[PDB]
């Protein structure tokens, strides 16, 4: 899409319809006449376009009105309302832009932001941009959180986020124009290599993959069409459902063999009855011919009865010979109908051990994409976010993804090495207690109007708690924290002195030996300028490999590589790095997934701010004080950088509305 | 509305494989045995039919009698009439058989005979005695 309508699309908005959010701010318009709505929609789409055409400079209300046409530029209170709305909710002027109107000299309100991850940073920038007092508290000695980038010499490899999942409607598409990211397209082609160290042929490869995709649609069919979602009170997982489907497919293959061989017996038994009748006829014929012969022995001239006997027996014999020939006829048809059915048996097996192994690689891939054993994913909802997939080729940040959080961090009050221990929120404001990660007995206290919590879900999950909430988070929030899944996936960075793999190939799989190890070093990435191969550890393997030393891991890495590329083409690696996200105390995992028994709705619960009780009893309902951003809070874009980024923009909007007032709603 | 084509997922089957933990492995074994059960039954009848096939060896070859090619006549030699009476006694209304025995009389001439020599050859009595067997 292009024009003003491309801008709406690129901003994840329907170009010809007002969103629920827009209805909330412009209820005069959306309940009003259709004419005004289209004026509104155009002004919105047009302003978005203007921002999108040039995201390196701030788009002011003046600049916007300047480039609008009659009849649209006539009503300025509308144009002003629209522009302000877009700016507030970070649809325009977000990320890193050059300001035209230098920041308000004195700030209003004070916000503490926990964590300088991307969601944290994105909010910080917005709030500071709205003229608020913002300070981020990061436990790590670096920004970006789950955007980690290994750097040494010229070796650059992301141990965290690595892929931009398409620029079509991606907020990262704007960020990429603002920040020097080197975006290289990822060539889709991925050759698999069995345990032996030799390629799967295109024959197999395609027939397994197509079976895999067939198997998924099947699970989708069990979920939505057969309502197969609860089993012994427990919510049905995807893994479960995939098994149930494979089983039913194995069952059917047998059902087919039975009914085919059952065709053989039914026919082979018709032949039996016929051969029996045939033996009994060659029996009567044998004896009847004897009698005719005995009557022909009585030499002429004979009387008429004796002549009759000869004639009679002759007729009776040719009558029985007619039948035997008609039965040798029938025998011929049935005897070939057997070589017919024995020529084409149905399928021998559903899948062989070679097949089931390649299919397991495809399962490993899904386990990687969701950073979790498929036995944990919700059947009904594991892909609830599919509709909001971006368009275009997936890309890599060739200069390392960290270039983004670092870029966003510029200009912000960030306290590194500062581990938040306790968040206290009350009717009259909040205080945050953090310590110094280095010498931990050294304590800090922060007073603020509001707290923005961007703590990873795995962190919020910690038992016993890493961060204490005073008063405790309400049960509706903590149940959402429990129900939700927070997965795990790890990366192995292999740095060499030379390329020894197909340089025109970005990714190539390794098929594991067992179901149990299907995610163990199952995939390899050739993405970077330097000679680096990156190796994924997904599924159940991810959680176990964290207990294994780097050498043992790199050993298996080299072994696999030798198997594929020849035992002497694979040298000893110059530099190696192994991630351990579940072990990492500031993550406690990689990213969230829709666990079985959760839904996309739990993500909304995560995003809902907390409003403390009143100080003095009988005093009015307070302002909300505790707010949440993060990958785990954005229903339509979970588990991603853009999603985090967007959630940060979301909360900054909401916080500003709350503490600076929304002038644009009148 | 429907599964992917060739995939089998009936409401009934789904419940059967999920009824317990190894109800999967149970049903897959019932069929594995049902197959082996039928498979040996195949070789059993294959064996039986092989023996029956060999007892039919040579066919009915040393038993066929060369073809009697004779032109259909209209007149009744006393011979032919007497052949007929006995054929009726042995075949009843099987005009085809009676025709084949007499050799040179058409299926209709046989039927004609029935009404012509009806009184003289007491064909009523002859036929009623054919039925008596
Ligand atoms: C669903 C698709 C997907 N999985 C995306 C990835 C992908 C995979 C496969 C194919 C294509 C793409 C994805 N790949 C990927 C790979 C790996 C290994 C991991 C771990 C993650 C990803 N993601 C997910 C994002 O990295 C993640 O959602 C955001 O970075 C999180 O930001 P925040 O919410 O701010 O938390 P955050 O970044 O963790 O920030 C929280 C901060 O709080 C700090 N903190 C914690 N505790 C305390 C405390 N007590 N006091 C103070 N501070 C504290 C902490 O240090 C941290 O800095 C990728 N996203 C993506 O867009 N592309 C990718 O390729």
Coordinates of N, CA, C and O in Angstrom, one line a residue, chain A residues 133-229:
Chain A
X133 N 10.3 14.5 34.2 CA 11.6 14.1 34.8 C 11.7 12.6 34.8 O 10.9 11.9 35.5
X134 N 12.7 12.0 34.1 CA 12.8 10.6 33.9 C 14.2 10.1 34.3 O 15.2 10.7 33.9
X135 N 14.2 9.0 35.1 CA 15.4 8.3 35.4 C 15.2 6.8 35.3 O 14.3 6.2 36.0
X136 N 16.0 6.1 34.6 CA 16.0 4.7 34.4 C 17.0 4.0 35.4 O 18.1 4.4 35.6
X137 N 16.5 2.9 35.9 CA 17.4 2.1 36.8 C 17.6 0.7 36.2 O 16.8 -0.1 36.1
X138 N 18.9 0.5 35.8 CA 19.3 -0.7 35.1 C 20.2 -1.5 36.0 O 21.2 -0.9 36.6
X139 N 19.9 -2.8 36.2 CA 20.8 -3.7 37.0 C 22.1 -4.0 36.3 O 23.1 -4.0 36.9
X140 N 22.0 -4.2 35.0 CA 23.2 -4.5 34.2 C 24.1 -3.2 34.0 O 23.7 -2.1 34.4
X141 N 25.3 -3.5 33.6 CA 26.3 -2.4 33.3 C 26.2 -2.0 31.8 O 27.1 -1.4 31.3
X142 N 25.1 -2.2 31.2 CA 24.8 -1.9 29.8 C 23.3 -1.7 29.6 O 22.5 -2.3 30.3
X143 N 22.9 -1.0 28.6 CA 21.5 -0.8 28.2 C 21.1 -2.0 27.2 O 21.9 -2.9 26.9
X144 N 19.8 -2.0 26.8 CA 19.3 -2.9 25.8 C 18.7 -4.2 26.4 O 17.9 -4.8 25.7
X145 N 19.1 -4.6 27.6 CA 18.6 -5.8 28.2 C 18.8 -7.0 27.3 O 19.9 -7.4 27.0
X146 N 17.6 -7.6 26.9 CA 17.6 -8.7 26.0 C 18.1 -8.5 24.6 O 18.1 -9.4 23.7
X147 N 18.5 -7.2 24.3 CA 19.2 -6.9 23.1 C 20.7 -6.9 23.5 O 21.3 -5.8 23.8
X148 N 21.3 -8.0 23.5 CA 22.7 -8.2 23.8 C 23.5 -8.5 22.5 O 23.1 -9.2 21.7
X149 N 24.7 -7.8 22.4 CA 25.5 -7.9 21.2 C 27.0 -8.2 21.6 O 27.6 -7.3 22.2
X150 N 27.5 -9.4 21.3 CA 28.9 -9.7 21.5 C 29.7 -8.9 20.5 O 29.4 -8.8 19.3
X151 N 30.8 -8.3 21.1 CA 31.8 -7.5 20.3 C 33.2 -7.9 20.8 O 33.4 -7.9 22.0
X152 N 34.0 -8.1 19.8 CA 35.5 -8.3 20.0 C 36.2 -8.4 18.7 O 35.8 -9.1 17.8
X153 N 37.2 -7.5 18.5 CA 37.9 -7.3 17.3 C 36.9 -6.8 16.2 O 36.5 -5.7 16.2
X154 N 36.6 -7.7 15.3 CA 35.6 -7.5 14.2 C 34.4 -8.4 14.3 O 33.4 -8.3 13.6
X155 N 34.5 -9.4 15.3 CA 33.4 -10.3 15.5 C 32.3 -9.6 16.2 O 32.4 -9.0 17.2
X156 N 31.1 -9.7 15.5 CA 29.9 -9.0 16.0 C 28.7 -10.0 15.9 O 28.4 -10.5 14.8
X157 N 28.2 -10.5 17.1 CA 27.1 -11.4 17.1 C 26.1 -11.2 18.2 O 26.5 -11.1 19.4
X158 N 24.8 -11.1 17.9 CA 23.8 -10.9 18.9 C 23.5 -12.2 19.6 O 23.1 -13.2 19.0
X159 N 23.7 -12.1 20.9 CA 23.3 -13.2 21.8 C 21.8 -13.1 22.2 O 21.2 -14.0 22.8
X160 N 21.3 -11.9 21.9 CA 19.8 -11.7 22.2 C 19.1 -11.5 20.8 O 19.4 -12.3 19.9
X161 N 18.2 -10.6 20.8 CA 17.5 -10.2 19.5 C 18.5 -10.0 18.4 O 19.6 -9.4 18.5
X162 N 18.1 -10.5 17.2 CA 19.0 -10.5 16.0 C 18.3 -10.2 14.7 O 18.9 -9.6 13.8
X163 N 17.0 -10.6 14.6 CA 16.2 -10.5 13.4 C 15.2 -9.4 13.5 O 14.4 -9.3 14.4
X164 N 15.1 -8.5 12.4 CA 14.0 -7.6 12.2 C 13.0 -8.4 11.4 O 13.3 -8.7 10.2
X165 N 11.8 -8.7 11.9 CA 10.9 -9.5 11.3 C 10.0 -8.8 10.2 O 8.8 -8.9 10.2
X166 N 10.7 -8.2 9.2 CA 10.0 -7.5 8.1 C 9.6 -6.1 8.4 O 9.1 -5.7 9.5
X167 N 9.9 -5.2 7.4 CA 9.7 -3.7 7.6 C 8.3 -3.3 7.3 O 7.9 -2.1 7.5
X168 N 7.4 -4.2 6.8 CA 6.0 -3.8 6.5 C 5.1 -3.5 7.6 O 4.5 -4.5 8.1
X169 N 5.1 -2.3 8.1 CA 4.3 -1.9 9.2 C 5.0 -2.0 10.5 O 4.5 -1.9 11.6
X170 N 6.4 -2.2 10.4 CA 7.2 -2.3 11.6 C 7.7 -0.9 12.1 O 8.2 -0.1 11.3
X171 N 7.4 -0.7 13.4 CA 8.0 0.6 14.0 C 9.5 0.6 13.8 O 10.1 1.7 13.7
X172 N 10.1 -0.6 13.8 CA 11.6 -0.7 13.6 C 12.0 -0.1 12.3 O 13.2 0.3 12.1
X173 N 11.1 -0.1 11.3 CA 11.4 0.4 10.0 C 11.7 1.9 10.1 O 12.6 2.4 9.4
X174 N 11.0 2.6 10.9 CA 11.2 4.0 11.2 C 12.6 4.2 12.0 O 13.4 5.0 11.6
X175 N 12.8 3.4 13.0 CA 14.0 3.4 13.8 C 15.2 3.2 13.0 O 16.3 3.8 13.2
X176 N 15.1 2.3 12.0 CA 16.2 1.9 11.1 C 16.6 3.1 10.2 O 17.8 3.2 9.8
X177 N 15.7 4.0 9.9 CA 16.0 5.2 9.1 C 16.7 6.2 10.0 O 17.4 7.1 9.6
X178 N 16.3 6.2 11.3 CA 16.9 7.1 12.3 C 18.3 6.7 12.8 O 19.1 7.6 13.1
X179 N 18.5 5.4 12.8 CA 19.8 4.9 13.4 C 20.5 4.1 12.4 O 19.9 3.4 11.6
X180 N 21.8 4.3 12.4 CA 22.7 3.5 11.5 C 22.7 2.0 11.8 O 23.6 1.5 12.5
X181 N 21.7 1.3 11.4 CA 21.6 -0.1 11.4 C 21.9 -0.6 10.0 O 21.5 0.0 9.0
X182 N 22.8 -1.6 9.9 CA 23.1 -2.2 8.7 C 22.2 -3.4 8.4 O 22.5 -4.5 8.9
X183 N 21.1 -3.2 7.8 CA 20.1 -4.3 7.6 C 20.3 -5.1 6.4 O 20.1 -4.7 5.2
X184 N 20.7 -6.4 6.6 CA 20.9 -7.3 5.5 C 19.8 -8.4 5.5 O 19.4 -9.0 6.5
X185 N 19.2 -8.6 4.3 CA 18.1 -9.5 4.1 C 18.6 -10.9 4.3 O 19.7 -11.3 4.1
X186 N 17.6 -11.7 4.9 CA 17.9 -13.2 5.2 C 17.4 -14.0 4.0 O 16.2 -14.1 3.9
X187 N 18.3 -14.6 3.3 CA 17.9 -15.6 2.2 C 17.2 -16.8 2.9 O 17.8 -17.4 3.7
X188 N 16.0 -17.1 2.4 CA 15.2 -18.1 3.0 C 15.7 -19.5 3.0 O 15.5 -20.3 4.0
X189 N 16.5 -19.8 2.0 CA 17.0 -21.2 1.7 C 17.8 -21.8 2.9 O 18.8 -21.2 3.3
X190 N 17.4 -23.0 3.3 CA 18.0 -23.7 4.5 C 18.1 -25.2 4.2 O 17.1 -25.9 4.3
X191 N 19.3 -25.6 3.9 CA 19.5 -27.1 3.7 C 19.7 -27.8 5.0 O 20.4 -27.4 5.9
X192 N 19.0 -28.9 5.2 CA 19.1 -29.8 6.3 C 20.2 -30.8 6.1 O 20.4 -31.2 5.0
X193 N 20.8 -31.3 7.3 CA 21.8 -32.3 7.2 C 21.6 -33.3 8.4 O 21.7 -32.9 9.5
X194 N 21.3 -34.5 8.0 CA 21.0 -35.6 9.0 C 22.2 -35.8 9.9 O 23.2 -35.2 9.8
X195 N 21.9 -36.7 10.9 CA 22.9 -37.0 11.9 C 24.2 -37.5 11.3 O 25.3 -37.3 11.8
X196 N 24.1 -38.2 10.2 CA 25.2 -38.8 9.4 C 26.2 -37.7 8.9 O 27.4 -38.0 8.8
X197 N 25.7 -36.5 8.6 CA 26.5 -35.4 8.1 C 26.3 -35.3 6.6 O 27.2 -34.8 5.9
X198 N 25.2 -35.7 6.1 CA 24.9 -35.6 4.7 C 23.5 -35.0 4.4 O 22.5 -35.3 5.2
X199 N 23.3 -34.2 3.3 CA 22.1 -33.5 3.0 C 20.9 -34.4 2.9 O 21.0 -35.5 2.3
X200 N 19.8 -33.9 3.4 CA 18.5 -34.6 3.1 C 18.2 -34.2 1.6 O 18.3 -33.0 1.2
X201 N 17.8 -35.2 0.8 CA 17.4 -34.9 -0.6 C 16.1 -34.1 -0.7 O 15.2 -34.3 0.1
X202 N 16.0 -33.3 -1.8 CA 14.8 -32.5 -2.0 C 13.5 -33.2 -2.0 O 12.4 -32.7 -1.6
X203 N 13.5 -34.5 -2.4 CA 12.4 -35.4 -2.3 C 11.9 -35.5 -0.9 O 10.7 -35.1 -0.6
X204 N 12.7 -36.0 0.0 CA 12.4 -36.1 1.5 C 12.0 -34.7 2.0 O 10.9 -34.5 2.5
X205 N 13.0 -33.8 2.0 CA 12.9 -32.5 2.5 C 11.5 -31.9 2.4 O 10.9 -31.4 3.3
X206 N 11.0 -31.9 1.1 CA 9.7 -31.3 0.8 C 8.5 -32.1 1.3 O 7.6 -31.5 1.8
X207 N 8.6 -33.4 1.2 CA 7.5 -34.3 1.7 C 7.4 -34.4 3.2 O 6.3 -34.7 3.7
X208 N 8.5 -34.0 3.9 CA 8.4 -33.9 5.4 C 7.9 -32.6 5.8 O 7.0 -32.5 6.7
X209 N 8.4 -31.5 5.2 CA 8.0 -30.2 5.5 C 6.5 -30.0 5.2 O 5.8 -29.4 6.1
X210 N 6.0 -30.5 4.1 CA 4.6 -30.4 3.7 C 3.7 -31.2 4.7 O 2.6 -30.8 4.9
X211 N 4.3 -32.3 5.2 CA 3.6 -33.1 6.2 C 3.5 -32.3 7.5 O 2.5 -32.3 8.2
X212 N 4.6 -31.6 7.8 CA 4.7 -30.7 9.0 C 3.7 -29.6 9.0 O 2.9 -29.4 10.0
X213 N 3.5 -29.0 7.9 CA 2.5 -27.9 7.7 C 1.1 -28.4 7.7 O 0.2 -27.8 8.1
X214 N 1.0 -29.6 7.1 CA -0.3 -30.4 7.1 C -0.6 -30.7 8.6 O -1.8 -30.6 9.0
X215 N 0.4 -31.1 9.4 CA 0.2 -31.5 10.8 C -0.2 -30.3 11.6 O -1.0 -30.4 12.6
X216 N 0.3 -29.1 11.3 CA -0.2 -27.9 12.0 C -1.6 -27.5 11.7 O -2.4 -27.4 12.7
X217 N -2.0 -27.4 10.5 CA -3.4 -27.1 10.1 C -4.3 -28.1 10.8 O -5.4 -27.7 11.1
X218 N -3.9 -29.3 10.9 CA -4.6 -30.4 11.6 C -4.9 -30.1 13.1 O -6.0 -30.2 13.6
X219 N -3.8 -29.6 13.8 CA -4.0 -29.2 15.2 C -4.9 -28.0 15.2 O -5.8 -27.9 16.1
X220 N -4.8 -27.0 14.3 CA -5.7 -25.9 14.2 C -7.2 -26.3 14.0 O -8.1 -25.7 14.5
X221 N -7.3 -27.4 13.2 CA -8.6 -28.0 13.0 C -9.2 -28.7 14.2 O -10.4 -28.7 14.5
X222 N -8.4 -29.3 15.1 CA -8.8 -29.9 16.3 C -9.2 -28.8 17.3 O -10.1 -29.0 18.1
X223 N -8.5 -27.7 17.3 CA -8.8 -26.6 18.2 C -10.1 -25.9 18.0 O -10.9 -25.8 18.9
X224 N -10.2 -25.4 16.8 CA -11.3 -24.4 16.4 C -12.6 -25.1 16.0 O -13.7 -24.7 16.2
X225 N -12.4 -26.3 15.3 CA -13.5 -27.0 14.7 C -14.0 -28.2 15.6 O -15.2 -28.5 15.5
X226 N -13.1 -28.8 16.3 CA -13.5 -30.0 17.2 C -13.5 -29.6 18.7 O -13.8 -30.5 19.5
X227 N -13.2 -28.3 19.0 CA -13.2 -27.8 20.4 C -12.4 -28.7 21.3 O -12.7 -28.8 22.5
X228 N -11.4 -29.4 20.8 CA -10.5 -30.2 21.5 C -9.4 -29.4 22.3 O -8.3 -29.2 21.8
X229 N -9.8 -28.9 23.4 CA -8.9 -27.9 24.1 C -8.8 -28.2 25.6 O -7.9 -27.6 26.3

